[PDB]
């Protein structure tokens, strides 16, 4: 159909989360040690964007296969960026722990986990059946990644 649904609410959520994840990746990749308060702030922006997506999308009708198809690439890219973020964070465990931030990072990751779960549960109600398996796999990959981050930092605080 040439009729285009206003899917701007979905696009906005993807964009807001992407901006937060990308900013975190910029800062983590250049982090080599020292105070990590800015990284925790980046994490907080990401949690707030995630929670905002739950609030923005709660009442949106489910996506058709055609509507979902236009969001597939954007979602896949965002999944890739989130998995990069988690791996980048784990890669910087040593300077983070040296700086006395390991517990703070653990705490932030536990909040990321809870927010991601809320959004994932909501997204599962909006995706059409044709994309349900692939969406669940992308969601599970994110959830499992966050947990690997939690495992990496668990108990490393002062």
Ligand X SMILES: CCCCC/C=C\C/C=C\C/C=C\C/C=C\CCCC(=O)O
Residues within the interface to ligand X (CB under 6 A): 10, 13-14, 17, 21, 24, 39-40, 43, 46, 50, 53, 63, 68, 71-72, 75, 78-79, 82, 85-86, 89, 105, 108-109, 112, 116, 119-120, 123, 126-127, 131, 134-135, 138-139, 142, 146
What is the DSSP secondary-structure string of 92-137?
Answer: THHHHHHTT-HHHHHHHHHHHHHHHHHHHHHHHTTS-GGGHHHHHH
What burial class does residue 49 get, using C-beta atoms within 10 Å of its C-beta: 0-12 exposed, 13-18 middle, 19+ buried? buried
Beta strand segments in 9-157, E: none
Residue closer to ligand X (CB basis): 99 or 146: 146
> Residue 2 Cβ, how far from ligand X at the closest point, in Å?
21
Residue closer to ligand X (CB basis): 2 or 120: 120
> Residue 126 Cβ, how far from ligand X at the closest point, in Å?
6
Distance separating alpha carbons of residues 73 and 93, to the nearest angstrom? 31
Residue closer to ligand X (CB basis): 1 or 8: 8
């Amino acid at each position: 159909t040439k009729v285009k649904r206003d899917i701007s609410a979905f696009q906005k959520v993807i964009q807001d989360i992407s901006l937060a994840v990308n900013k975190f990746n910029v800062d983590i990749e250049r982090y080599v040690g020292g105070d990590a308060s800015h990284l925790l702030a980046d994490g907080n922006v990401l949690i707030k964007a995630t929670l905002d997506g739950v609030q923005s999308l709660q009442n949106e009708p489910p996506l058709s296969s055609m509507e979902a198809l236009a969001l597939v690439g954007p979602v896949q890219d965002l999944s890739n960026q989130i998995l990069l973020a988690i791996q980048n964070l784990i890669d910087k465990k040593e300077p983070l722990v040296q700086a006395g931030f390991g517990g703070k990072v653990e705490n932030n990751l536990r909040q990321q986990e809870e927010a991601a779960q809320k959004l994932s549960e909501l997204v599962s109600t909006k995706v059409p059946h044709e994309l349900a398996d692939i969406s669940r796999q992308l969601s599970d990959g994110i959830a499992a990644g966050i947990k690997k981050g939690i495992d990496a930092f668990a108990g490393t605080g002062p």
